[PDB]
């Protein structure tokens, strides 16, 4: 299936809702954690792991501050996620 | 009557797979975090919050070391979870 790639800049910790809403809608999400504390970034990765497990998605680390969640039926490449994140 | 409440004893973050599998199957899960550090317990609660968001479930704190994830339309009450725990 073909999915949209939603880039998310986490400006505050309450932005896990944005990752959740887009991924639950069947979109791939590439999220940047460079504006968060070390502790907040750990919380986001754990929450995204939960979303991913529940909907049988795929999770990947792009770099030290960038991760992505991809729906089960989507074939989205690492390069496509990097381009969407402007990496 | 005889609704499925899955008990889980956590030893590390990897045991989150057991909570996820049961909850994704539409079962309520009651998990104990007494063997974990406060940092590890925080990680488990965040993972379970991700599960809840994805499947529109309910999360509740039973005590300082016991939490539960309940499917959206579960016919189980807080008192039933407390009795099971």
């Amino acid at each position: 299936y073909q999915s949209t790639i939603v880039p998310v800049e986490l400006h505050s910790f309450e932005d896990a809702q944005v990752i959740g809403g887009a991924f639950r809608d069947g979109d791939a999400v590439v999220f940047d954690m460079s504006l968060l504390s070390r502790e907040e970034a750990r919380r986001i990765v754990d929450f995204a792991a939960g979303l991913c497990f529940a909907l049988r998605g795929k999770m990947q680390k792009i770099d030290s501050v960038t991760f992505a969640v991809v729906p089960e039926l989507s074939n989205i490449s690492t390069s496509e996620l990097e381009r969407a994140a402007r990496i | 009557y005889q609704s499925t409440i899955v008990p889980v004893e956590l030893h590390s973050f990897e045991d989150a797979q057991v909570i996820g599998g049961a909850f994704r199957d539409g079962d309520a899960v009651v998990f104990d975090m007494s063997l974990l550090s406060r940092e590890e317990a925080r990680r488990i609660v965040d993972f379970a919050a991700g599960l809840c968001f994805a499947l529109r479930g309910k999360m509740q704190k039973i005590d300082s070391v016991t939490f539960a994830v309940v499917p959206e339309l579960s016919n189980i009450s807080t008192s039933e979870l407390e009795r099971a725990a």
């Binding site: 309450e14 896990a16 809702q17 | 406060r38 317990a41 925080r42 609660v45 965040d46 919050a49 809840c52 968001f53 309910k58 999360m59 509740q60 704190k61 300082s64 939490f67």
Partner: peptide, 8 residues
């Protein structure tokens, strides 16, 4: 303190 997050 260990709690259920605000949005839940």
């Amino acid at each position: 303190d260990l709690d259920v997050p605000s949005f839940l």
